[PDB]
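Why this split exists: single-chain examples teach little about how molecules sit against one another. For that reason, every record in the complexes split bundles all components of an assembly together and asks for one structure covering all of them. Below is a record exactly as it appears in the raw files.
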Amino acid sequence: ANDNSEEMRHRFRQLDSKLNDLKSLLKEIANNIK
Amino acid sequence: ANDNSEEMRHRFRQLDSKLNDLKSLLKEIANNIK
């Protein structure tokens, strides 16, 4: 039993975590300026 | 009847919304600096 939906899914999760980290750093800079 | 194009599609829509939010925050900071 082999599939590739989980591996591309997990790539989607790791880029989702990266985008969350980018939004976190942007909110940090938006608070540091003001 | 089962498919997985809609679920990965919906992941694409939620990251599309996240990228729109990132662009919104970047335009906000670009206006706050100037």
